[PDB]
Structures are given as structure tokens and as C-alpha cells.
Design a protein around this ligand. Structure first.
Ligand code: 7TS
Ligand code: 7TS
Lengths: 414, 414
């Protein structure tokens, strides 16, 4: 207990407003995170003082912009404990990162008979690129089954991954179930069968320490907007030996060395994978978000979210007619459904109380079908959320159930 | 003469600072543009007040974020006079836009015998994707020759484009020569031969009115960072009938309709081409930049730059031992070389005087080889630049030539 939630919330201006006459209760951070003043003011200082194109060699502002951009790259490398800045590629988000792996690695290393292994809980960003890659290569897509509590057993991984598996793609933390998957053990299993492992870390990176050397993941993808950083920015980490043999996914300026009429050569890593003017301000702001989270401490944030999750699970179990999906040990989110109430109505009623949650399939339709549901509601937490906000959520859920129950009993007597 | 350059410069905080003890003279807007307070404060208001993920249906902040994002899309449609918002795709920049055309259109519509026709003046962003597409399809890449003044004659276009040409890719305005290419006539020629036309408008969009219906371009690409907007944002316009038949370049959430285990269906345009959480803040800020430029008036900006260019050409012709490349009628930039002085040294010396220019190949190596030079220096203008800054530039060039000349004559007597 070191982080002061009041002092933390003070730095997020967007939290201090009312919606529909109620204080805002933002419980949708798995959709996107809010930003502290440090990040916004970093963007401000960039645009006010030293914006210029990068990879300079000349004027002063351009040198400052380049120093900021590449310094943000080093901040990311340190943040996820990569060995080298050559392994840190700035992208526009997790989805693009995974698509780059699918185009530049998968489509070049898949033949008929090869297998791509994923799971039923994957976000669409970690499903559709593999569907398209196996369709383009004639390979086979396989799914690791889930336990009844929404977890993955290592025996099922060993059964699904075979000597024909070349890629295992798996989420670090599920944006729906809250499950934290055994990424390190799955990486060992994939390597034992001759496969690489691609980790979707969009939901893990904001909330827990990432050590790619301890995870031994071959690729790791993350999104800035979920971790207090600017929108439109993400990272692809890849083992350097793998990135060296992969061809670029995009072509143009900045990523070339020599350009002839018909043939060209590429720059060294990481710039080989960064075509065109890069996301300068967004990457610098992501570096600022990393500084912010590191000063608070990712372990502290994870402990705070563990307490929030345990509190929320207990208080949800106090509600009648509410079903929660996923395991007991979980990240900081709760996906649920009210008996006989569609989750979109739940979320509308909650917004009328100032509470922001998300209703729908959460970009995980195969998981919804596995859960035997059409849609769900989800309240997700971050470092600025409190137990009082969870109390407001559970009270609003009780009031929602009562309201729908007795308008039903009112006009069934009509 | 309606725009007041003092009142315009007042809105750009970054211009009001010193570099190396001299007032900043920023003449590098072809590399990237500076931002007015309207754009920066738009980003601020987004992150301070209504950041949330988009394509909602539920809570209030999410609705406001979606309204901002799609309203920016409509602003772009109006700005370039597209028929429909379905034709406006948000990307991370011109380079990505052109790569999307090359992957989703070119690689699907090119067979052996087909031709992709480009020009010798193209930026690398409008060269390498076509190189890779013709290599992947076995098609042929052809180059339209240039006149001695760096312009393109329509007869050379008719000679190069044949009945086997399926794509003509050409820059609207050259970032090196300042040439404004006859895009409308070239589009007529390409359509007469059964080809589509792809327009690289990265350098035209910030400085002159764009009317895609009058140009009749099939694709048009632009970058936000060159037109007073945030970094990491761009637009791909494509004729709707063409975009409907093109498969997505990226896959994941937000761009799907139904997702099965092995097959999926895509959303309608434009969202079919926008995978993952989009560039929300950057797109809203690009809309703000469009509002800013429209309130000033693109025709006014073009007239101001025409005067700046004529003034600069005249004053450059007053300098001995300076060569300027390109035609007399031009956009607002001057690419040049000092006799017996490497342009990187020119640009270093100028930065010591507070003047920001760019030295190098400007991501146009085939053009440099066509010019029979290794590198060039370039001063590029925008709406905040003045004739006094051009005076400072030409005086600093005279002083550079004198300094190098007589340190040469000093230590040749050594
Ligand atoms: C696990 C996981 N993978 C991939 C993505 C998508 O990456 P991005 O969009 O490219 O930043 C998300 C975002 N998840 C959600 C986005 O909105 N609701 C969500 O649950 C995610 O949670
Ligand atoms: C004509 C032209 N096409 C494409 C691009 C690149 O697009 P983007 O990088 O994806 O925004 C540029 C940027 N031109 C320059 C960028 O730095 N110096 C330049 O001359 C350009 O001027």
C-alpha cells in the first residue's frame, strides 16, 4: 500500500466531471485508458517547442525531435526488458503489430501441413490475421480448448501443439475473462515443438510488469492507448534474430537504404519496419506514459487491481441473478450478465447513473459463442479506480434489476 | 491579400523561440508542418474531456468520442470534395495509404504483362510499394521521363502509358522540384488506356485546394503532419466502387461483421479498412487543422506561397554560384546547391544562424540521380513564413559561400 489513489486521480482531469447529473464513474479502461497530465503536457510541449521531422543530421529542432523519438524507443525497451532497441518497433497499435507478424513472418514460414495454434478466448486482433495467413498459405488453424472456468490447462496446450505447429498465438490477459494465461510455460511448450510464440499483450502491458526475457516470447504486441498513452501508437517486440529474417510489411521512405529504379535495400532494425514519417508525438507521449507508470510502479498498480478485482467479485456474488464469467484469480475486470436483462440495456441504465461500462461481444465472438451468450457487460478497472466506484456499480446493478423486474410486473398486469 | 501573416504566426507557439542565439527561421515545412493553438488545444480538450473508445452505442464519453472521430471523417470528405464518407479511410500517413493501395488493389489486379507507370520525381513512398507489387505479381514497372525543367509533358505520359498499363501512380506536387503535375489530364490519359490513377498528394493537400471529383483521381493519399495536423495520421481516398472490390490490408476488430472460427465477414466502407482501435485523437486534430486552414482559405495560402516562391526564386538568382532545381512555376519550396559546398554543411551553417532547412536526397534517390547530384539543400515554406525569412536565408547563403570560399583561400596558402 504505497500509491495514494487521491493523488493519482488528481492527475487525470477527465475524471472530474459529471455525466447526466452524476459524478463520472469510468469503468471502461479495457476499452481505453485515460491520460494523466504528464502525458498530455508531453504532447503539448512537443507541439509547442520542438516538433520537426526525425532522423535528422541537421537543424536543432529536428535533432530534439529525433532524440525524443528514439529516447522513447529506449524507454519502451527498458519497460518490457527487451535486449535491444532493434527489437522495439513503433506501430499504430496492437492490431497492426499482430498483422505485421502475420504478413511478414507467418505468410513466409507457413506451408500446407503447418499449423497455427490459437485459443477460443482471443481478441479478434489475434484471430483474423491468422485466419487470413492460413488461408493464403494453405496451412491449418487450430484452437486450444478452455477449462470450464475460462482458463487454459498446459496439458491441452501440449495436446493441441504438435511437431507441425509453427506458430502459437495467445493472449497474455483476456479482455473478457480476466484470465492471466501461463505465457512462459506455453512458450516453453511451443519452442519444444519447433514453433514460435506470439503474445497479445494489449491487456497485460498496462496493468502488470512485462519481462520479455523471462517470458521468452518470440513476439509481443501492445497498445499505447490502453496504458495511459496517446491513441494511434503501439509496439511490436520481436526477437532480433527473427526480425532480421523477416521482410518489411510496409515500404517507402525512412525504411530504405538504397533505392534503385526497380530494386531497393532496407535499413537495419528497427527502422526496416518503420516506413514513412513516424508517429513522433504519440511515441514520445507513450514514453511519458511509461515514465508515469514506472514512477507509480507496475507492481503497485497490479496489487491495487488485485484488491479491486477481489472486492468486485465478492460484491457481485452478493447480487442475485447476476452471472460473472471467468476465473477467481484474474486481472482487474469483471464481465457479467444480469438475468433477463440485455447487457446493452444494463449499460444504458448505468450511463444514466454516470457509470461507463461496455456492452457487446468485446471483439471476441468465438468466446461469446463458447460462453453460450450473445453479448455481455463489462466493467474494467485501472489505477485511478476505487472501491467506492465499485460500490456505485453494484448498487446501480441492484437498482437496474429491481427497475426491470417491476416494470415487467407492472405491465404484465396490463 | 486577406491573410494577416502576423496574426497567423501568433497562433503557432513554436515559432517564437531562439536557436543558437538567433530567432528561429523554420523553412522545413515540406519535412513537417508546425501546429496552431487550435489543433494542440483540440488534442488537449479530447484527452481532458471526452476520450473513450469509439463505435459505441453506450456511455456518454464514448458517444462524444465517436461523434468527434466520424465528424472529423466528414470534415475530410468535405475538404477534398469526396462524394462519400465511405471513400475516406483514416490511416497513419501517406506512406501507409499508398501501401494499402499497392497491397489490396495492385497485388490483386496485376498479372504478367501488366504495367505500373510512375515517374522519376516520385517520393520513395510512391516507388517502393509499386516495386514490391510488380515483383510479387510479375508485372512491369515503367517510368515517365521528365523534361529538362523537371516537368512532365502529356505526350510522354501518352507514350509511357499503354493498353497494358493498369496503374499510373504520380505525385500531385513534388517535394523536391516544386513541380505541380497535370493530375487531371494524366487521369484522363490513364482512364483512356484502362488504368486507374493513384495520386500522392502529401505535398499538395497542405498548400492548395484538393477536389478529387475535378481531378477524377481513383486514389489520393495525404498526411496530417504536413498540413498543421497531428503526427501519425493520414488519409486514403479511393473511389467507392474500387474500395468495395478491394480486400482489407489489415485484419482484426472493428473492421469485422461476423467472426467464425475460420472465416469472417467485413464491415461496410470505410470501416472495412480500419482495423483495431483507431487514431481517435489524431483524426479529431486533423479535423481541427482542416477547420483552421479552411477559415484561412486554401486559395489565400496558395497565393501567399506563390508570392513567397517568386520572391525566393528572384533572390536566389541574385546569388552567384547557386543552382536551383525545377521549374519557374512551382509550389512553395526551393531545392538548390551551393557551388563547391556540400548541402549538409550548408544546412549546418544555416542552423547555426537559426535557419532550419533540410539537406540530403529528400527520399527521392532516383530523382537525385536524374539531377546528376548526390544530395541537395531545400528550404520549404508554409502559411507562417515571410519574405523577411527568405531574406535571412539568402543572406546566410551569401555568408556561407564567402566563409567557405575564403577559408579555402586561407589554408590553400598553408
Ligand atoms: C486483448 C486485446 N487484444 C487486442 C486489442 C485491440 O488492440 P488495439 O485495438 O489495436 O489497441 C485489445 C483491445 N481491447 C478492447 C478494445 O475495446 N474493448 C476492448 O476489450 C485487447 O484488449
Ligand atoms: C510527396 C511526398 N510523398 C510522400 C511523403 C511521405 O509521406 P509520410 O512520410 O507517410 O507523411 C512525403 C513526405 N515528404 C517529406 C518528408 O520529409 N521530407 C520530405 O520531403 C512527400 O513529401
Amino acid at each position: 500500500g504505497h500509491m495514494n489513489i487521491t493523488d493519482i486521480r488528481e492527475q487525470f482531469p477527465i475524471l472530474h466531471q459529471q455525466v447526466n447529473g452524476h459524478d463520472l464513474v469510468y469503468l471502461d479502461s479495457a476499452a481505453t485508458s485515460q491520460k494523466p497530465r504528464a502525458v498530455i503536457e508531453t504532447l503539448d510541449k512537443y507541439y509547442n517547442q520542438y516538433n520537426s521531422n526525425v532522423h535528422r543530421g541537421v537543424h536543432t529542432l529536428g535533432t530534439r525531435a529525433t532524440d525524443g523519438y528514439e529516447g522513447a524507443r529506449e524507454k519502451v525497451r527498458k519497460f518490457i526488458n527487451a535486449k535491444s532497441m532493434a527489437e522495439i518497433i513503433f506501430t499504430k497499435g496492437t492490431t497492426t503489430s499482430l498483422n505485421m507478424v502475420a504478413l511478414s513472418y507467418a505468410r513466409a514460414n507457413l506451408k500446407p501441413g503447418d499449423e497455427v495454434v490459437i485459443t477460443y478466448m482471443e481478441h479478434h486482433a489475434n484471430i483474423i490475421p491468422w485466419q487470413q495467413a492460413v488461408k493464403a498459405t494453405g496451412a491449418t488453424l487450430k484452437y486450444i480448448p478452455l477449462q470450464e472456468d475460462g482458463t487454459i490447462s498446459l496439458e491441452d496446450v501440449r495436446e493441441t501443439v504438435t511437431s507441425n505447429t509453427k506458430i502459437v498465438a495467445v493472449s497474455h490477459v483476456s479482455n473478457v475473462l480476466g484470465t492471466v494465461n501461463p505465457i512462459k510455460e506455453m512458450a516453453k511448450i511451443a519452442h519444444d515443438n519447433g514453433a514460435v510464440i506470439v503474445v497479445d499483450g494489449a491487456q497485460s502491458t498496462p496493468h502488470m510488469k512485462i519481462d520479455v526475457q523471462d517470458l521468452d516470447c518470440d513476439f509481443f504486441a501492445l497498445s499505447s492507448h490502453k496504458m495511459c498513452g496517446p491513441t494511434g501508437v503501439g509496439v511490436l517486440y520481436g526477437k532480433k534474430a527473427l526480425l532480421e529474417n523477416m521482410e518489411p510489411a510496409e515500404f517507402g521512405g525512412e525504411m530504405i537504404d538504397f533505392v534503385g529504379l526497380y530494386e531497393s535495400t532496407w535499413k537495419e532494425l528497427p527502422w526496416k519496419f518503420e516506413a514513412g514519417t513516424p508517429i513522433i508525438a504519440g511515441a514520445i507521449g507513450l514514453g511519458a506514459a511509461i515514465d508515469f507508470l514506472e514512477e507509480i510502479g507496475l507492481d503497485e498498480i497490479s496489487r491495487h487491481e488485485h484488491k479491486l478485482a477481489a472486492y468486485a467479485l465478492e460484491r457481485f456474488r452478493q447480487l442475485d441473478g447476476v452471472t460473472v464469467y471467468g476465473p477467481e484469480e484474474r486481472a482487474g475486470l469483471v464481465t457479467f450478465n444480469l438475468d433477463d436483462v440485455h447487457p446493452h440495456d444494463v449499460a444504458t441504465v448505468l450511463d444514466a447513473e454516470g457509470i461507463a461500462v461496455r456492452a457487446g461481444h468485446h471483439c471476441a465472438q468465438p468466446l461469446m459463442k463458447w460462453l453460450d451468450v450473445t453479448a455481455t457487460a463489462r466493467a474494467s478497472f485501472y489505477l485511478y479506480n476505487t472501491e467506492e466506484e465499485i460500490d456505485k456499480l453494484v448498487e446501480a446493478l441492484q437498482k437496474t434489476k429491481e427497475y426491470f423486474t417491476n416494470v415487467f410486473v407492472d405491465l404484465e398486469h396490463h
